[PDB]
């Protein structure tokens, strides 16, 4: 069988924690029956169900802390867009598009004109 | 020896587990070319150098 990720996201924080304990209890019993039977493929379903609950549990707490740091500077570093080491050190679009006040007048007064040569 | 660090014994445990023959069901797999364990080690035939 196995649990479904979409069925777990509709549960509260305590329901997921209580379900994780039951899956851990269920895994313990199968590890006792495993040593007395030639094969036990059922143990894979229980182990991957635990990974599903732990993923949803970690996703809910990460989403909750992402909302209390929302719309403010200095968000924690694992909730930040890594994307590269070097690209993080690169200038932002605002900083890279900065021009001095003197050259701003030259671009306004003398733009690159559009023209063609036939007549 | 007989009074060894944990790091030495950890490599001892790994070398003991790899000292096994091939499982018999591996030879029956489709497109299999492995015939015998070519990385077999024996304490009398060759030393593992820690």
């Amino acid at each position: 069988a196995g649990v479904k990720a979409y069925e777990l996201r509709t549960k509260s924080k305590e329901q997921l924690a209580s379900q994780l304990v039951d899956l851990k209890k269920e895994l313990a019993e199968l590890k006792v029956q495993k040593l007395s039977r030639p094969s036990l493929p059922k143990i894979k379903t229980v182990r991957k169900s635990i990974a599903c609950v732990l993923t949803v549990i970690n996703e809910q707490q990460r989403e909750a802390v992402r909302q209390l740091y929302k719309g403010k500077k200095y968000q924690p570093k694992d909730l930040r867009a890594k994307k590269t080491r070097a690209l993080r050190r690169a200038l932002t679009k605002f900083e890279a598009s900065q021009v001095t006040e003197k050259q701003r007048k030259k671009q306004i007064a003398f733009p690159q004109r559009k023209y063609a040569i036939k007549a | 020896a007989a009074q060894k660090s944990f790091r030495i014994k950890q490599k001892m445990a790994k070398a003991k587990k790899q000292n096994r023959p091939l499982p018999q069901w591996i030879r029956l797999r489709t497109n299999n070319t492995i015939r015998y364990n070519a990385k077999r080690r024996n304490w009398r035939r060759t030393k593992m150098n820690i």
Binding site: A28, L35, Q61 | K16, K17
Partner: protein, 121 residues
């Protein structure tokens, strides 16, 4: 006015006020759960024929335990997973790289009667 009276010829760094850390963001913002809980301390019982005879004779439970667990956590997990009293815990590292724990119960409990509740016998 005069200056300070110094009774020693040695000048040493003054004790300045140390400020406690007040970070503007958490270091990880999600605390990791218990790395080694009761279900990770005890993995599976060891059911070799020599280990089984120690259960009904010496009232000693033989378990395979995590290599990161000490005698404190093994004792705490045994009395929480099975609700028994522990007299002493003896541990060894097996030659295959796994930890083996000899858990002896008190005289108020029977190891054979609770190994049946656990399963294996």
């Amino acid at each position: 006015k005069a200056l300070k009276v110094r009774t020693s010829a040695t000048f040493r760094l003054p004790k300045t006020l140390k400020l406690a850390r007040a970070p503007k963001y958490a270091s990880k913002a999600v605390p990791h759960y218990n790395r080694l809980d009761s279900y990770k301390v005890i993995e599976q019982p060891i059911t070799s024929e020599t280990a089984m005879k120690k259960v009904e004779d010496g009232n000693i439970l033989v378990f395979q335990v995590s290599m990161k667990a000490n005698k404190y956590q093994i004792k705490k997990a045994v009395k929480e997973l099975y609700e028994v009293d522990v007299l002493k815990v003896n541990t060894l590292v097996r030659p295959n790289g796994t930890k083996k724990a000899y858990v002896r119960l008190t005289a108020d409990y029977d190891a054979l009667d609770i190994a049946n509740r656990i399963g294996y016998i």
